[PDB]
Specification:
Blueprint (H helix, E strand, L loop, with lengths): L1 H10 L3 H11 L6 H4 L19 E3 L7 E9 L4 E6 L7 H11 L3 E4 L4 E2 L2 E2 L13 E3 L4 E10 L3 E10 L5 E9 L12 H12 L10 E4 L6 H17 L8 H8 L10 H16 L3
Parallel strand pairs: 3-11, 4-10, 4-11
Antiparallel strand pairs: 1-2, 2-3, 5-6, 7-8, 8-9, 9-10
Bound molecules: ligand JN1.
The ligand O=C1CN2C[C@H](N1)c1ccccc1S2(=O)=O binds next to loops.
GO cellular component, one term: cytosol
Subunit structure: Interacts with EPHA3 (phosphorylated); dephosphorylates EPHA3 and may regulate its trafficking and function. Interacts with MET. Interacts with NCK1.
Keywords: Acetylation, Endoplasmic reticulum, Hydrolase, Membrane, Oxidation, Phosphoprotein, Protein phosphatase, S-nitrosylation
């Protein structure tokens, strides 16, 4: 059981050691499309690339490339798109992907500015009456409503395909209180946030995969997907303590490199799964 394994690693202070074994066992697949010179202004970080095998392709004949991966968790029957925070020149591509993959939700785990630098473009409207038009991808985005709570904001957005005049409702789940350094002290507000996303239907198989991002799309984003999938597997399995976080994380790392960036994020993931298991047992 992971709770005892938690106490063992914590009492022995072995988190950096566990984390290094995960780093050493992690998959390494080609990312040739990411590294083409024509794609250098589509990547926020030169050392964070989708693998070719799991990369989301835009349906635009010119350049299909976006820094985004499909993470397919076969046993849990859950998919996620993990992506980087959009850049100024990729906001249109972002919303094109949302449209094309039939996503119902967008999960944002960063603030636009952290540590005095921009981590993400402002890619949604701040006021109802000032909609955004992405001329490159022929999409219109309108803010419908915004519910601001202590730890997170939920926004209803209308995405319109200007080409077909079809419209869809997108839910934007913005976790606003992840600290600039380290991880939250308690996983309570993060679990509350994850349960809210689940309750919305955004993670349900009726819809395309949820889009999840932070700045790079691997750290905080990783923690979100890892906790969700681990909790879902505990519901599904005859024996809930058969769930090994380290194995699930390595399975997720076949689809996108670097998921969970620090030993602190790994400890936090264990704590979130352990605490969330109480509200699921
Ligand atoms: O802050 C930026 C702005 N861009 C995204 C990324 N960094 C980058 C990296 C290498 C070359 C060009 C660019 S960018 O498109 O100007």
């Amino acid at each position: 059981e992971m709770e005892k394994e938690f106490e063992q690693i914590d009492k022995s202070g072995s988190w950096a050691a566990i984390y290094q074994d995960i780093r050493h066992e992690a998959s390494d697949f080609p990312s040739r499309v990411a590294k083409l010179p024509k794609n250098k202004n589509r990547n926020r970080y030169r050392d964070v690339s989708p693998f070719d095998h799991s990369r989301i392709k835009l349906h635009q004949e010119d350049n299909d490339y976006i820094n985004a991966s499909l993470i397919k968790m076969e046993e849990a029957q859950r998919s996620y798109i993990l992506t980087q925070g959009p850049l100024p020149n990729t906001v249109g591509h972002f919303w094109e992907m949302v449209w094309e993959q039939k996503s119902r939700g967008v999960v944002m785990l960063n603030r636009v500015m952290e540590k005095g630098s921009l981590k993400c473009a402002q890619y949604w409207p701040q006021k109802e009456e000032k909609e955004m038009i992405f001329e490159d991808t022929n999409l219109k985005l309108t803010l419908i409503s915004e519910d601001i709570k202590s730890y997170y904001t939920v926004r209803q957005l209308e995405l319109e395909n200007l080409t077909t005049q079809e419209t869809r409702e997108i839910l934007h789940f913005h976790y606003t209180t992840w600290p600039d350094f380290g991880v939250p002290e308690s996983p309570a507000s993060f679990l509350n946030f994850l349960f809210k996303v689940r309750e919305s239907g955004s993670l349900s198989p009726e819809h395309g995969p949820v889009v999840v991002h932070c700045s790079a799309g691997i750290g905080r984003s990783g923690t979100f997907c890892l906790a969700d999938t681990c909790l879902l597997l505990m519901d599904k399995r005859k024996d809930p303590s058969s769930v090994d976080i380290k194995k699930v994380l390595l399975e997720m790392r076949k689809f996108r490199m670097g998921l969970i960036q620090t030993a602190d994020q790994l400890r936090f993931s264990y704590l979130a799964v352990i605490e969330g298991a109480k509200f699921i047992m």
